[PDB]
Design an enzyme around this catalytic site. Structure first.
Site, PDB file in Angstrom:
ATOM      1  N   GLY A   9       0.800  -1.223   0.000  1.00 20.69           N
ATOM      2  CA  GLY A   9       0.000   0.000   0.000  1.00 20.69           C
ATOM      3  C   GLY A   9       0.833   1.274   0.000  1.00 20.69           C
ATOM      4  N   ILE A  11       2.055   5.269   0.730  1.00 19.18           N
ATOM      5  CA  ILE A  11       2.335   6.004   1.941  1.00 19.18           C
ATOM      6  C   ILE A  11       0.997   6.402   2.577  1.00 19.18           C
ATOM      7  CG2 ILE A  11       3.619   7.918   2.924  1.00 19.18           C
ATOM      8  CD1 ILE A  11       5.089   8.062   0.095  1.00 19.18           C
ATOM      9  N   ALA A  12       0.769   5.970   3.818  1.00 18.87           N
ATOM     10  CA  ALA A  12      -0.377   6.435   4.635  1.00 18.87           C
ATOM     11  C   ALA A  12      -1.665   5.680   4.381  1.00 18.87           C
ATOM     12  CB  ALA A  12      -0.610   7.942   4.421  1.00 18.87           C
ATOM     13  N   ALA A  13      -1.592   4.630   3.561  1.00 21.42           N
ATOM     14  CA  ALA A  13      -2.767   3.847   3.195  1.00 21.42           C
ATOM     15  C   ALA A  13      -3.336   3.094   4.402  1.00 21.42           C
ATOM     16  CB  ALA A  13      -2.443   2.881   2.056  1.00 21.42           C
ATOM     17  N   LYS A  15      -1.035   0.601   6.408  1.00 30.19           N
ATOM     18  CA  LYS A  15      -0.322  -0.684   6.545  1.00 30.19           C
ATOM     19  C   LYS A  15       0.082  -1.024   7.974  1.00 30.19           C
ATOM     20  CE  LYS A  15       2.884   0.587   3.832  1.00 30.19           C
ATOM     21  NZ  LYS A  15       2.198   1.908   3.539  1.00 30.19           N
ATOM     22  N   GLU A  34       8.331  -2.866   8.276  1.00 33.77           N
ATOM     23  CA  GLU A  34       9.196  -2.222   7.301  1.00 33.77           C
ATOM     24  C   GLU A  34      10.335  -1.523   8.045  1.00 33.77           C
ATOM     25  OE1 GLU A  34       8.638  -0.331   3.344  1.00 33.77           O
ATOM     26  OE2 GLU A  34       7.440   0.985   4.554  1.00 33.77           O
ATOM     27  N   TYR A  57      16.180  12.680   2.004  1.00 28.64           N
ATOM     28  CA  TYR A  57      15.270  13.811   1.982  1.00 28.64           C
ATOM     29  C   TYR A  57      15.974  15.068   1.399  1.00 28.64           C
ATOM     30  CZ  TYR A  57      11.855  17.327   3.172  1.00 28.64           C
ATOM     31  OH  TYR A  57      10.952  18.380   3.105  1.00 28.64           O
ATOM     32  N   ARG A  99       5.156  -4.504   3.529  1.00 27.20           N
ATOM     33  CA  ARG A  99       5.808  -4.348   2.232  1.00 27.20           C
ATOM     34  C   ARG A  99       6.831  -5.448   1.975  1.00 27.20           C
ATOM     35  NH1 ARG A  99       6.328   1.736   2.388  1.00 27.20           N
ATOM     36  NH2 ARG A  99       4.492   2.626   1.295  1.00 27.20           N
ATOM     37  N   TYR A 159      -1.754  13.940   6.981  1.00 26.67           N
ATOM     38  CA  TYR A 159      -2.163  14.973   7.944  1.00 26.67           C
ATOM     39  C   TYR A 159      -2.507  14.381   9.322  1.00 26.67           C
ATOM     40  N   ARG A 161      -1.489  11.519  10.766  1.00 25.41           N
ATOM     41  CA  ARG A 161      -0.264  11.066  11.448  1.00 25.41           C
ATOM     42  C   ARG A 161       0.468  12.317  11.914  1.00 25.41           C
ATOM     43  NH1 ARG A 161       2.894   6.286   8.439  1.00 25.41           N
ATOM     44  NH2 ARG A 161       3.235   7.975   6.947  1.00 25.41           N
TER      45      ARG A 161
HETATM   46  C1  LIG Z   1       8.421  15.112  -5.212  1.00 23.32           C
HETATM   47  O1  LIG Z   1       8.907  15.622  -3.939  1.00 23.32           O
HETATM   48  C2  LIG Z   1       8.856  14.781  -2.865  1.00 23.32           C
HETATM   49  C3  LIG Z   1       8.632  13.416  -3.008  1.00 23.32           C
HETATM   50  C4  LIG Z   1       8.590  12.576  -1.892  1.00 23.32           C
HETATM   51  C5  LIG Z   1       8.798  13.109  -0.625  1.00 23.32           C
HETATM   52  C6  LIG Z   1       8.747  12.330   0.528  1.00 23.32           C
HETATM   53  N1  LIG Z   1       8.992  12.745   1.778  1.00 23.32           N
HETATM   54  C7  LIG Z   1       8.846  11.832   2.753  1.00 23.32           C
HETATM   55  C8  LIG Z   1       9.121  12.163   4.220  1.00 23.32           C
HETATM   56  S1  LIG Z   1      10.841  11.720   4.725  1.00 23.32           S
HETATM   57  C9  LIG Z   1      10.610  11.411   6.436  1.00 23.32           C
HETATM   58  N2  LIG Z   1      11.637  11.675   7.263  1.00 23.32           N
HETATM   59  C10 LIG Z   1      11.531  11.453   8.577  1.00 23.32           C
HETATM   60  N3  LIG Z   1      12.572  11.747   9.348  1.00 23.32           N
HETATM   61  C11 LIG Z   1      10.327  10.950   9.104  1.00 23.32           C
HETATM   62  C12 LIG Z   1       9.272  10.690   8.211  1.00 23.32           C
HETATM   63  N4  LIG Z   1       8.107  10.210   8.640  1.00 23.32           N
HETATM   64  N5  LIG Z   1       9.441  10.921   6.899  1.00 23.32           N
HETATM   65  C13 LIG Z   1       8.421  10.586   2.250  1.00 23.32           C
HETATM   66  C14 LIG Z   1       8.148   9.317   3.066  1.00 23.32           C
HETATM   67  S2  LIG Z   1       8.278  10.714   0.580  1.00 23.32           S
HETATM   68  C15 LIG Z   1       9.011  14.472  -0.476  1.00 23.32           C
HETATM   69  C16 LIG Z   1       9.047  15.304  -1.588  1.00 23.32           C
HETATM   70  O2  LIG Z   1       9.272  16.636  -1.455  1.00 23.32           O
HETATM   71  C17 LIG Z   1       9.652  17.108  -0.127  1.00 23.32           C
HETATM   72  C18 LIG Z   1       9.612  18.645  -0.221  1.00 23.32           C
HETATM   73  F1  LIG Z   1       8.348  19.122   0.147  1.00 23.32           F
HETATM   74  C1  LIG Z   2      12.398  15.800  -2.444  1.00 21.75           C
HETATM   75  O1  LIG Z   2      12.483  14.562  -3.147  1.00 21.75           O
HETATM   76  C2  LIG Z   2      12.321  13.458  -2.369  1.00 21.75           C
HETATM   77  C3  LIG Z   2      12.553  13.475  -0.996  1.00 21.75           C
HETATM   78  C4  LIG Z   2      12.354  12.316  -0.252  1.00 21.75           C
HETATM   79  C5  LIG Z   2      11.959  11.144  -0.894  1.00 21.75           C
HETATM   80  C6  LIG Z   2      11.730  10.015  -0.138  1.00 21.75           C
HETATM   81  N1  LIG Z   2      11.107   8.912  -0.542  1.00 21.75           N
HETATM   82  C7  LIG Z   2      10.920   7.958   0.384  1.00 21.75           C
HETATM   83  C8  LIG Z   2      10.275   6.606   0.034  1.00 21.75           C
HETATM   84  S1  LIG Z   2      11.573   5.581  -0.791  1.00 21.75           S
HETATM   85  C9  LIG Z   2      11.346   4.023  -0.041  1.00 21.75           C
HETATM   86  N2  LIG Z   2      12.067   2.997  -0.518  1.00 21.75           N
HETATM   87  C10 LIG Z   2      11.957   1.773   0.018  1.00 21.75           C
HETATM   88  N3  LIG Z   2      12.703   0.776  -0.474  1.00 21.75           N
HETATM   89  C11 LIG Z   2      11.071   1.546   1.054  1.00 21.75           C
HETATM   90  C12 LIG Z   2      10.319   2.616   1.506  1.00 21.75           C
HETATM   91  N4  LIG Z   2       9.488   2.425   2.489  1.00 21.75           N
HETATM   92  N5  LIG Z   2      10.471   3.834   0.963  1.00 21.75           N
HETATM   93  C13 LIG Z   2      11.435   8.329   1.627  1.00 21.75           C
HETATM   94  C14 LIG Z   2      11.415   7.481   2.903  1.00 21.75           C
HETATM   95  S2  LIG Z   2      12.085   9.865   1.491  1.00 21.75           S
HETATM   96  C15 LIG Z   2      11.707  11.123  -2.270  1.00 21.75           C
HETATM   97  C16 LIG Z   2      11.910  12.292  -2.998  1.00 21.75           C
HETATM   98  O2  LIG Z   2      11.698  12.379  -4.325  1.00 21.75           O
HETATM   99  C17 LIG Z   2      12.011  11.204  -5.032  1.00 21.75           C
HETATM  100  C18 LIG Z   2      11.931  11.558  -6.516  1.00 21.75           C
HETATM  101  F1  LIG Z   2      10.860  10.865  -7.078  1.00 21.75           F
HETATM  102  O1  LIG Z   3      -8.231   3.001   9.433  1.00 21.40           O
HETATM  103  C1  LIG Z   3      -7.366   3.892   9.542  1.00 21.40           C
HETATM  104  C2  LIG Z   3      -6.110   3.755   8.919  1.00 21.40           C
HETATM  105  C3  LIG Z   3      -5.160   4.761   9.064  1.00 21.40           C
HETATM  106  N1  LIG Z   3      -5.471   5.849   9.798  1.00 21.40           N
HETATM  107  C4  LIG Z   3      -4.492   6.929  10.003  1.00 21.40           C
HETATM  108  O2  LIG Z   3      -3.807   7.248   8.791  1.00 21.40           O
HETATM  109  C5  LIG Z   3      -2.438   7.538   9.052  1.00 21.40           C
HETATM  110  C6  LIG Z   3      -1.578   6.521   8.313  1.00 21.40           C
HETATM  111  O3  LIG Z   3      -1.753   5.209   8.873  1.00 21.40           O
HETATM  112  P1  LIG Z   3      -0.491   4.201   8.886  1.00 21.40           P
HETATM  113  O4  LIG Z   3       0.714   4.697   9.640  1.00 21.40           O
HETATM  114  O5  LIG Z   3      -1.034   2.878   9.366  1.00 21.40           O
HETATM  115  O6  LIG Z   3      -0.158   4.206   7.295  1.00 21.40           O
HETATM  116  P2  LIG Z   3       1.030   3.357   6.597  1.00 21.40           P
HETATM  117  O7  LIG Z   3       2.110   4.369   6.240  1.00 21.40           O
HETATM  118  O8  LIG Z   3       1.491   2.434   7.675  1.00 21.40           O
HETATM  119  O9  LIG Z   3       0.369   2.729   5.375  1.00 21.40           O
HETATM  120  C7  LIG Z   3      -2.245   7.404  10.547  1.00 21.40           C
HETATM  121  O10 LIG Z   3      -2.367   8.687  11.151  1.00 21.40           O
HETATM  122  C8  LIG Z   3      -3.395   6.527  10.985  1.00 21.40           C
HETATM  123  O11 LIG Z   3      -3.688   6.734  12.379  1.00 21.40           O
HETATM  124  C9  LIG Z   3      -6.755   5.948  10.418  1.00 21.40           C
HETATM  125  O12 LIG Z   3      -7.068   6.946  11.105  1.00 21.40           O
HETATM  126  N2  LIG Z   3      -7.663   4.977  10.267  1.00 21.40           N
END
Ligand SMILES: COc1ccc(-c2nc(CSc3nc(N)cc(N)n3)c(C)s2)cc1OCCF
Ligand SMILES: COc1ccc(-c2nc(CSc3nc(N)cc(N)n3)c(C)s2)cc1OCCF
Ligand SMILES: O=c1ccn([C@@H]2O[C@H](COP(=O)(O)OP(=O)(O)O)[C@@H](O)[C@H]2O)c(=O)[nH]1
Ligand SMILES: COc1ccc(-c2nc(CSc3nc(N)cc(N)n3)c(C)s2)cc1OCCF
Ligand SMILES: COc1ccc(-c2nc(CSc3nc(N)cc(N)n3)c(C)s2)cc1OCCF
Ligand SMILES: O=c1ccn([C@@H]2O[C@H](COP(=O)(O)OP(=O)(O)O)[C@@H](O)[C@H]2O)c(=O)[nH]1
Lengths: 229, 233
Positions: A9, A11-13, A15, A34, A57, A99, A159, A161
């Site tokens: 699923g 992000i945030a679905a 899981k 994960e 990031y 995952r 939002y 979370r």
């Molecule tokens: C296309 O641009 C982006 C694409 C993906 C992302 C992502 N940021 C995050 C957050 S990184 C992060 N760091 C942490 N320390 C904790 C946490 N929950 N997440 C993802 C999981 S995916 C962020 C992106 O832009 C960030 C700028 F707004």
């Molecule tokens: C600002 O640009 C970015 C900043 C952060 C990210 C991130 N993507 C993710 C998801 S990558 C990933 N790979 C995995 N193998 C597993 C998993 N849970 N997540 C983060 C945790 S941070 C992705 C970003 O853009 C990627 C370009 F598409």
């Molecule tokens: O039935 C649900 C499933 C998810 N969430 C909320 O949605 C966010 C993402 O959930 P989770 O961390 O489980 O997502 P994941 O990244 O694990 O798929 C969190 O704030 C959960 O509390 C919720 O309120 N009800």
């Protein structure tokens, strides 16, 4: 004899939520988080994981390859561990993975390459490192559960979370990830390097509605899914 | 295994490639595993293609590429070393597989020196070490060594040998860097000070050959030591 089921699923679905509910419903049901989840929160992995996460990031185009390789290893060894020393005394053991090695590559690492955060050499090195590292054999899945949620549902849940680092995830990024999951798990138009994957059972669960205190129908579908296996 | 596995170590252009092509020829019971990167240096499989590229990127920008290249080169080694170990010498009476360098060379010579040169940051180096521990354990059990043959020459002789080996992409290699690699080879194989995270290595028998003198036409004495060394394993 342990059945392997991946929980897939966006992000945030939902899981972690779904997996955390499942663990508590049976002593024969166990759960492999994960590692990126454990990072997104000291062991050497936890320090390594945190640093690489923030590095990625800050500059995805420098650190994507490093992130992805360490994400995948950390996941293979966490799965192999839980498989090796869990559930030996269960009659019906099932291991649920948050995952899989297949999300790592065909969703995430693919998406980073498609966005030029990996060059051709990094991507090819990565797939070769994956095609081989995964030969990790005993990790073939018995089924896949797809927790389906609209790109929009996910963004609101980001939002709910409410982690500061996540609020700038673009709806644009969720949407690309979403089409990847759909083509892989719904359309099934993805041709991977793992023979069995074109025919593994998938269970698609609509989680667009909040299920935290109304999960019986979903758990019921999982139990029926598990019977087919 | 029944196969005897022996790694040939030493600094760049010490003459490992030379010596390895000499040994392969002498006995039907002897097989060699040539080094992936040494293969990439010249000139197209997937690996060769990635190989040529990451090696070139490595050279241009090592702070950027040292982690990626080190992972690939060690993966590539472990692959090829498995391929020979489960493929060749299957009907041989006293089988010997000569590895051109080892997973230990990867980690304790090259990766290590790059972390020390600031070409890998701390996180890169600890992630690398993490994987190397794990990658050799999940995949590299049957690769464990029975002995090492240290071809020990001085940097100057090696520098001398690069200048003569007429390879233009290498004419840039500086001395202090060869000194640095030599110093780490001395600490690992001569004095055995260098700590590894591989217990059994502490105790692996090690033959050191002084290879300053030219041996291409005249290698019989070296081989006699090898054969003497082998007869104690
Ligand atoms: C296309 O641009 C982006 C694409 C993906 C992302 C992502 N940021 C995050 C957050 S990184 C992060 N760091 C942490 N320390 C904790 C946490 N929950 N997440 C993802 C999981 S995916 C962020 C992106 O832009 C960030 C700028 F707004
Ligand atoms: C600002 O640009 C970015 C900043 C952060 C990210 C991130 N993507 C993710 C998801 S990558 C990933 N790979 C995995 N193998 C597993 C998993 N849970 N997540 C983060 C945790 S941070 C992705 C970003 O853009 C990627 C370009 F598409
Ligand atoms: O039935 C649900 C499933 C998810 N969430 C909320 O949605 C966010 C993402 O959930 P989770 O961390 O489980 O997502 P994941 O990244 O694990 O798929 C969190 O704030 C959960 O509390 C919720 O309120 N009800
Ligand atoms: C810090 O300064 C150096 C440190 C190391 C090196 C090395 N160059 C090489 C040559 S890399 C190479 N690339 C190829 N593509 C082919 C081939 N035969 N060799 C080594 C084996 S080590 C070269 C260095 O200087 C080159 C830039 F002045
Ligand atoms: C311009 O600066 C450099 C240029 C090239 C290099 C190289 N080092 C090496 C040795 S890395 C290595 N790792 C292995 N695992 C095996 C092996 N034969 N070689 C090359 C092949 S190229 C190193 C360089 O500087 C590194 C920081 F001083
Ligand atoms: O005793 C020796 C051994 C080797 N060489 C030459 O020096 C170069 C470096 O040797 P080699 O390629 O075997 O070194 P390696 O990098 O494999 O240790 C080669 O072109 C050899 O012809 C030499 O002149 N004298």
């Amino acid at each position: 004899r342990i059945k392997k089921i991946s929980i897939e699923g966006n992000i945030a679905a939902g899981k972690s939520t779904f997996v955390n509910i499942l663990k508590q419903l049976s002593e024969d049901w166990e759960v492999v988080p994960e590692p990126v989840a454990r990072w997104s929160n000291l062991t050497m992995e936890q320090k390594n994981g945190g640093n690489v996460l923030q590095m990625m990031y800050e500059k995805p185009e420098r650190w994507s390859f490093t992130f992805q390789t360490y994400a995948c290893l950390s996941r293979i060894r966490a799965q192999l561990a839980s498989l090796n020393g869990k559930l030996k005394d269960a009659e019906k053991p099932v291991l649920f993975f948050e995952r899989s090695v297949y999300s790592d590559r065909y969703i995430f690492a693919s998406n980073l390459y498609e966005s030029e955060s990996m060059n051709e050499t990094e991507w090819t090195i990565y797939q070769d490192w994956h095609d081989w590292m995964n030969n990790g054999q005993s990790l073939e899945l018995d089924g896949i559960i797809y927790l389906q949620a609209t790109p929009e549902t996910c963004l609101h849940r980001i939002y709910l979370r409410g982690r500061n680092e996540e609020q700038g995830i673009p709806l644009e990024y969720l949407e690309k990830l979403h089409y990847k999951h759909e083509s892989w798990l719904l359309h099934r138009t993805l041709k991977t390097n793992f023979d069995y994957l074109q025919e593994v059972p998938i269970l698609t669960l609509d989680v667009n509605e909040d299920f935290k205190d109304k999960y019986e129908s979903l758990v019921e579908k999982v139990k029926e899914f598990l019977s087919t296996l």
